[PDB]
UniProtKB/TrEMBL annotation, chain E:
The chain holds residues 103 to 204 of 204 of the full protein. Residues 13-29 form the Prokaryotic-type class I peptide chain release factors domain. This is Peptide chain release factor H. Coiled coil: none annotated. It comes from the Bacteria. It comes from Escherichia coli. Belongs to the prokaryotic/mitochondrial release factor family. One of its GO terms (molecular function) is translation release factor activity.
TrEMBL record, chain F:
GO terms for cellular component: cytoplasm; ribonucleoprotein complex; ribosome. Keywords: Metal-binding, Ribonucleoprotein, Ribosomal protein, Zinc. NCBIfam families: rpmJ_bact. One of its GO terms (molecular function) is structural constituent of ribosome. Pfam families: Ribosomal_L36 (PF00444). PROSITE patterns: RIBOSOMAL_L36. This is Large ribosomal subunit protein bL36. Disulfide bonds join 11-14, 11-27. Coiled coil: none annotated. It comes from Escherichia coli (strain UMEA 3162-1). The gene is rpmJ. Zn(2+) binds at residues 11, 14, 27, 33. Belongs to the bacterial ribosomal protein bL36 family. One of its GO terms (biological process) is translation. Signal peptide: none annotated.
Amino acid sequence: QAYVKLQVAAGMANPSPPVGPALGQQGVNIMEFCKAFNAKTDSIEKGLPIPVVITVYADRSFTFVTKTPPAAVLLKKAAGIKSGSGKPNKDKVGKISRAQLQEIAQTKAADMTGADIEAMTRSIEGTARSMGLVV
Amino acid sequence: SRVAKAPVVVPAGVDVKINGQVITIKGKNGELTRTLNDAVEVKHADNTLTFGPRDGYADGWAQAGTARALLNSMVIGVTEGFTKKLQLVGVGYRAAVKGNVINLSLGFSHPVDHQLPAGITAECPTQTEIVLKGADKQVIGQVAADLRAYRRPEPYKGKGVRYADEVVRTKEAKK
Amino acid sequence: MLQPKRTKFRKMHKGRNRGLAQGTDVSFGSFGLKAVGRGRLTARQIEAARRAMTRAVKRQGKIWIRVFPDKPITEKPLAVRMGKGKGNVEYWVALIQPGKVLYEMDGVPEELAREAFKLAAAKLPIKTTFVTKTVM
Amino acid sequence: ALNLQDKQAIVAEVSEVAKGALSAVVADSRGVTVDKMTELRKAGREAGVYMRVVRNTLLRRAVEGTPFECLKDAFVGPTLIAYSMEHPGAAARLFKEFAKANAKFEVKAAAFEGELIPASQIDRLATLPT
Amino acid sequence: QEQSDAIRYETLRSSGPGGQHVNKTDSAVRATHLASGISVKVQSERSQHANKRLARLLIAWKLEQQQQENSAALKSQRRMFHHQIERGNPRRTFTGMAFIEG
Amino acid sequence: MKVRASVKKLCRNCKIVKRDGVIRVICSAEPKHKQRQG
Amino acid sequence: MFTINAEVRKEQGKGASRRLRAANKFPAIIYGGKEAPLAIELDHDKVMNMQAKAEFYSEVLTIVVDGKEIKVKAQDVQRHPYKPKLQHIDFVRA
RNA sequence: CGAUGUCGGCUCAUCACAUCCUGGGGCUGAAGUAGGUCCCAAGGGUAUGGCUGUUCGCCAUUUAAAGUGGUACGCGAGCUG
RNA sequence: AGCCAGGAUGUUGGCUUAGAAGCAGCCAUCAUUUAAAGAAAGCGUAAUAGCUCACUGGUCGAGUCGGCCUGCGCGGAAGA
Ligand SMILES: [Mg+2]
Ligand SMILES: [Mg+2]
Ligand SMILES: [Mg+2]
Ligand SMILES: [Mg+2]
Ligand SMILES: [Mg+2]
Ligand SMILES: [Mg+2]
Ligand SMILES: [Mg+2]
Ligand SMILES: [Mg+2]
Ligand SMILES: [Mg+2]
Ligand SMILES: [Mg+2]
Ligand SMILES: [Mg+2]
Ligand SMILES: [Mg+2]
Ligand SMILES: [Mg+2]
Ligand SMILES: [Mg+2]
Ligand SMILES: [Mg+2]
Ligand SMILES: [Mg+2]
Ligand SMILES: [Mg+2]
Ligand SMILES: [Mg+2]
Ligand SMILES: [Mg+2]
Ligand SMILES: [Mg+2]
Ligand SMILES: [Mg+2]
Ligand SMILES: [Mg+2]
Ligand SMILES: [Mg+2]
Ligand SMILES: [Mg+2]
Ligand SMILES: [Zn+2]
């Protein structure tokens, strides 16, 4: 029920500008989500986006369970760049490697619905290829 | 054709009386009599009605399908009947019933007073909603259409008499 | 607007336009716009159809014009009597007999060629049809 | 699908029923994508992708396929009862997993016949190798 | 702006008729340029068609003048600029033989 | 209503109907697509 | 393999060929070799369906005329100028 | 061609509908007001002046509107000239 | 054809933008769980959010679909 994922990098407490009214459409407050978010980000490093499920239940007591950091920012850390690629196929921005890709896919295995991590490594391979990153 | 294939079952306590092209169906709700086109052959088979073309009639099957649908609606009407639910939208709009006359306040300078036919009975659970019940599907649809024609739902706010099931597409005044 | 660069004579007899055409097979492209009807296409009409089909195919593939307007058509100016010599050449036409392949096209899919030829045929005075290369 | 692809699919199910002895049944009248994804993840984390949820239980598709072996499954065709084969191991534990699947928010449409692989009854057999 | 060729023709009788067939025939052509305000009336020929052609040329020519008085008023404005330059409060001041500042 | 000699389906939801010997296009989605041959 | 049933034309010429094409047939001729040419009439629809295939003009064809198989190849086809129709076909004995 | 008198005005019209107004209606880039466009519709109605011989046109001021055409560009054995 | 469900993961693809998250535009237009799902066909927003669609499976249970050639009709079609 209204389980919607719209947040930013954890480094910003009370991320009012980027998200704003969407996080406060219903009778939900702005403070409860931020306090839960920081409560979780105590246990991880700061600065990364973190997706969370949000059941806005009637008694004003929401159930939230979080996921892994986005593979987008994770492959951004892997490429050590900020901008991925524009007009990708004409000009190659950077080059990326299968084994470290497998290192990427092994750690996020628990959250992703994949048993053979080779499939998810092909998935992240295609993701990087579109991202402008030929492996 | 394919509609005419399916026989119309007559439940318990539904007196069917075929006479040439005139069929009188009678149920707990009421009685409905309807004459069919000459091109239709209708026969009652011990619990059911079946329809087909008469030989020498070009549009036999289409007429038969129409007859099958009409008689099936007659069956449904005499057993449980049909109901249409209108519900007014807009400030100041309301409806009331006085026996068999719906009094409508739809933003007019005069009272709108819709008389009903014999078979249709109306009621208003609220001021906004009009639920009307009847045996004949065509008559109830026609009365609902008349009421909705009193004030057709506008496109800019959906204001007007609307069918509850109806979705009123809303337009925006672009500035 | 096609027009002969030079002509050996400046004016031409009315003539007649009986008979079936000669360029009947698709010869250069893969698809063709064939004339079912009979008549004369002006240079303006040929240009208009060519523009429509070129724009429809997005300047992709290749298009042949298999008819060329080489018959000059004269008109007398408004408010002039019936004698006093032949009128001035105003435009050029190609006589079209039933069966004439008017335009050909390839390098495009068959459906795109059909769509382009439909838009082009809307600009022509004669009735047309869609044809394809036939082996033999 | 033209007849050839249907023939490969029927050969596939015949091969799978030949290869694997045990199986389970499921009917998704109010089978949610969540429970379906969980039954897929169950098969995946236990073993390879061979395990499927294939809904090929027609009166002329699975009923045509079964006369090879497990002819007793021919009667099951009516009323949309699906299958989930299980190749390796003697009497794997995924029979009861559908019992929990029906327990947790399903209208009870599968009715858990169990197809009597050991020629048992329809009622659950909680006894399995451990 | 080059106002579009949207001429509109109205063909009527001619002024200063001189004759029965003239009194009765409608041969003068009054042309009007829409979104301009230019209305001419050509009747300097025996027939409608010559007047209509002359009217096309004359609409062209009257827009050509409208252009000419427009550009000529711009000419006049540009010279008048040469007489309205106050040789005082400078917007900007440059010094020396090499314009050394701003 | 568009009254035309050439009435066509303008989208998916346009439907050709012959009513009282007149070809008409009735569109549930778009009232602008309502057409009547004439 | 394409097998084309044919009849020997009773009469020949312009009017006769018009009459065949009106009666949903069309003329054709088998020539080639030392045998004299054979003028045949063919059912138009059958042969139109056959020649829709591209191999109609490549493979060897069998014309059955008077209960006699003749091996040919389609040498040339006369098409109606603006209709999907066949006017005449040349077969060369194969 | 042993004569079918022209323009305009006046008087008196009559018909058509491709409708200016009034009437009905669809769509609208139709909130309302006011519009735009199309469809139906010919019952009735549908300016006075200044200038010019004018028709027209421009202008002034009206009007619900100041329709478009046919009628020997209706109408001189009806008038004017 | 109607009827029941899914229509997801990478991903909210990166930019330039004021913001762009399928739907402002440019390009790539791929890969994964695969009965099936387009870096998105349409609708929806400030951007989201959100509703259909593609496809797919389920029920029903005999025809169905659109191209071609053709006969005869229909609209297009207003005047004193
Ligand atoms: Mg000659
Ligand atoms: Mg020639
Ligand atoms: Mg003189
Ligand atoms: Mg004259
Ligand atoms: Mg009617
Ligand atoms: Mg019209
Ligand atoms: Mg002859
Ligand atoms: Mg005379
Ligand atoms: Mg006389
Ligand atoms: Mg009208
Ligand atoms: Mg209107
Ligand atoms: Mg009148
Ligand atoms: Mg009248
Ligand atoms: Mg009348
Ligand atoms: Mg009356
Ligand atoms: Mg006249
Ligand atoms: Mg007169
Ligand atoms: Mg008059
Ligand atoms: Mg008189
Ligand atoms: Mg007079
Ligand atoms: Mg007289
Ligand atoms: Mg005088
Ligand atoms: Mg279906
Ligand atoms: Mg017609
Ligand atoms: Zn539409």
